[PDB]
Design a protein around this ligand. Structure first.
Ligand code: ABN
Ligand code: ABN
Lengths: 359, 110, 110, 360
């Protein structure tokens, strides 16, 4: 027998999910674990050094990571980078230099995103002054630094435009940035105030439709941003809660805590009872399934202590994640059906993502 | 008492308590460097009944302490209220940003 | 099984079985590089009753797989019989020496 | 209040021990954990990147580490280094560049040592060809590569000479290297064969006296190298085992598995029953205490699944370590007495060491 390398991932792209393991106890050795959701098989991994972030290219061909190095890890010169990796070979291809201010923090989706057309990576900076950085993937260059986003946080791509995204600002409104084909800001706009920052803070995680996004609040309200036109129209609140729910102090909690099934308008939210100040990152007692058209709950199932989720539109799937284990649900019908649990997928993960299949 | 996550002044710690890591509540373990910036918490002191502002500076430039991990969230808010937010590394602007542990520094009355 | 430390070929593995890591017993997981050097084990095949030489090549250039850790020591000897020794990183001479997982390559009859 | 740094370790040096945590599950973030052995308090730590090794300077002032960096961890140029750290401040002082072949492997004491006079660090290389590297600490230089030690492994300092050490070779003998004041090889000699590599392989860990070293074998024999005279005199085997021991197949097992209490001549060894091919790294069912003069066992106590140990001659202590927990023993009398266990001292450690006290 002869040992060989150079092999590709053994399962098709459509089976693959990406569990971003922060390895917080040893955060300099964070990594992405690649799994087959159909059978729980471990397929491979990508090392991501200190507090890596990850996404897969919208065309499915590449994995992008964002990380920080130092010459001697705990001393020496800093290098913040985006790396491009081949998706099938799980090999490093290209390093893209960033200014030394990429966000270091827990793995919310909105810290490391891309334009709908896949041509630009859009990432959150904090120095601690905030701005949004734009990376031209084809050129392998950092091309724009959106200082207009100072005092805002996180990136919500608009799926109905090729190079547009929104961010949540300290005024309780949204800033929309439209990039040109060079990755430089082509235009921008600011919405009216959507929520009260002080009185009803929202979770940053969007329940994202093709032309609108919904947000849930610490107190269980729902806000919306409709971007079917060039100007974003905002509304809310409506409550997730009926009177019975209020009696037991149900509120949302988690990290990447919501999701939207676009074909049905169903919104999925992690909830727990006995909510009070300081419980907004508690594990889910339940998942609630909301009809966003009627603004009413349709179903509720056990939460399995999950903290983060993600949705695959075309296969009608939801993954949930409790930090270590990934649950796979069929959401083709209003009540999610649990298909399997992948145990020990990570030591400390708050983010799982599907391989894109939409092109 | 101070090494417990429910010690009153640790009400918005996301990290390892420095007092379990060879330091104290207000001093970095040897060879780790204080952050000049921090997130801020407002914590109730149940012993005198008053609310205090606590500044959660990290100690930086050494790898994760691993001891006395806490994830408490009283009055913590998302990144659009940035200095109330604890899901970011407050060592981010240090000469070396590697996160070691978190301190809980009393600033004064809230 | 092959993912068990008790599988006959794994009789001198100190490491993570590559077959649990997206590879196989004789192929590195994607993006990890085979070592040109290895330690050697003599393992008994209980099926045919014969002893075989197994070459334990590491796969390198990615961080620890972490799955299917084994520490089996049949016929293993200290570093003064260097190529029979498994407490060293057999990735030591690769372009990147970071250890990912261990393969169990059948060389032939002992 | 104001947060401050620049502080020293809170407990005095004589209270300190160093638990080398490989963190094998995340081997790129290995580190040294500093503990107070008197009360189990965590005192601090030194980061040691990929598969760090550690020792304390003989004079107790500095911590030496050895590690490997790459520019991008899993890719880019390699830098193998020794680092000098201040012991009281646990701060980095100096990097000494090594050729890119320092031993990567589990933390046996003999892979990273120093001359008795403290002037030179003596380390094992493997490319995979083996050689011994010499580092001049004061100068911050890599002084020479002892290629004469090809086919040998590990470093056993001779405590009765300022800059001499031995290594165990594939011929079953010992090579002795004597350095000049510049750290270069001044002379060398080879012993007669001490043990059969094929029939009675020894564990590399010495039970080290001032002028001799004892070694135990896979089958429970003891060998000796005496370096009191001009050249090394070797002998053995004698058996650790009586008839009852043999009938139950007791043999040694572990990693840093032996120690010598020099004032008494007591040797400490991890043992387990039902020994056979493949059990030489098994956790200790018991610790046996042997009188090396009478060649008799004088005590046996539960092993607490220990794998590695270390002895302090100055306070008459033995530490043992099971991978995660450190047991502290008083060995001032033939039967060791367990004082305490420090739980959770490491995730994956096979080496603990005391901070040196005295020892001139
Ligand atoms: N809140 C401390 C921390 C450190 C690193 C990443 C996230 C959070
Ligand atoms: N092949 C066993 C191994 C790998 C890395 C480090 C030590 C030992």
């Amino acid at each position: 027998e002869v040992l060989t390398g150079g092999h590709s991932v053994s399962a098709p792209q459509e089976n693959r999910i990406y569990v971003m393991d922060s390895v917080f106890m040893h955060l300099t050795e964070s990594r992405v674990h690649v799994y087959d959701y159909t059978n729980g098989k471990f397929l491979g991994m990508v090392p991501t050094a200190f507090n890596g972030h990850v996404q897969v290219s919208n065309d499915g061909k590449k994995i992008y990571t964002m990380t920080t190095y130092h010459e001697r890890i705990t001393r020496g010169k800093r290098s913040d980078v985006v790396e491009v990796w081949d998706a099938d070979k799980l090999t490093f291809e290209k390093e893209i230099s960033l200014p030394p201010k990429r966000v270091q923090g827990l793995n919310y989706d909105g810290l490391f995103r891309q334009t709908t057309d896949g041509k630009f990576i859009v990432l959150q900076n904090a120095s601690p002054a905030t701005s949004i950085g734009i990376v031209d993937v084809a050129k392998g260059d950092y091309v724009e630094d959106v200082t207009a986003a100072a005092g805002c946080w996180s990136v919500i791509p608009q799926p109905n435009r090729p190079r547009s995204f929104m961010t949540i600002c300290g005024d309780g409104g949204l800033l929309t940035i439209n990039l040109g084909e060079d990755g430089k800001v082509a235009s921008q706009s600011r919405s009216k105030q959507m929520f009260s920052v002080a009185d009803d803070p929202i979770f940053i995680a969007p329940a994202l439709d093709k032309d609108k996004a919904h947000f849930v609040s610490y107190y269980g309200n729902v806000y919306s941003a409709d971007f079917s036109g060039d100007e974003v129209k905002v509304d809310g609140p409506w409550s997730l809660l009926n009177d019975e729910d209020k009696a037991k102090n149900w509120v949302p909690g988690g990290y990447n805590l919501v999701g939207l099934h676009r074909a049905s308008g169903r919104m999925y939210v992690f909830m727990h009872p006995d909510g009070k100040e300081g419980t907004h990152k508690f594990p889910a007692a339940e998942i609630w399934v909301m009809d966003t058209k009627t603004k009413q709950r349709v179903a509720r199932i056990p939460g399995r202590d999950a903290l983060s989720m993600t949705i695959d539109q075309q296969r009608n799937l939801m993954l949930t994640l409790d930090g270590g284990n990934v649950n796979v649900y069929d959401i083709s019908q209003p009540e999610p059906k649990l298909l399997r649990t992948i145990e020990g997928a990570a030591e400390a993960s708050l983010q799982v993502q599907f391989h894109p299949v939409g092109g | 008492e101070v090494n417990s996550c429910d010690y009153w002044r640790h009400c918005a710690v996301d990290g390892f308590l420095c007092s379990c890591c060879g330091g104290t509540t207000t001093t970095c373990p040897p060879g780790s460097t204080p952050s000049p910036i921090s997130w801020i918490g407002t914590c109730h002191n149940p012993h005198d009944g008053k609310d205090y502002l606590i500044s959660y500076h990290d100690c930086c430039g050494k790898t994760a302490c691993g001891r006395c991990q806490c994830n408490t969230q009283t009055r913590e808010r998302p990144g659009y209220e940035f200095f109330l937010h604890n899901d970011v590394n407050w060592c981010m602007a240090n000469e070396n940003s590697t996160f070691h542990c978190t301190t809980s520094v009393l600033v004064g009355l809230a």
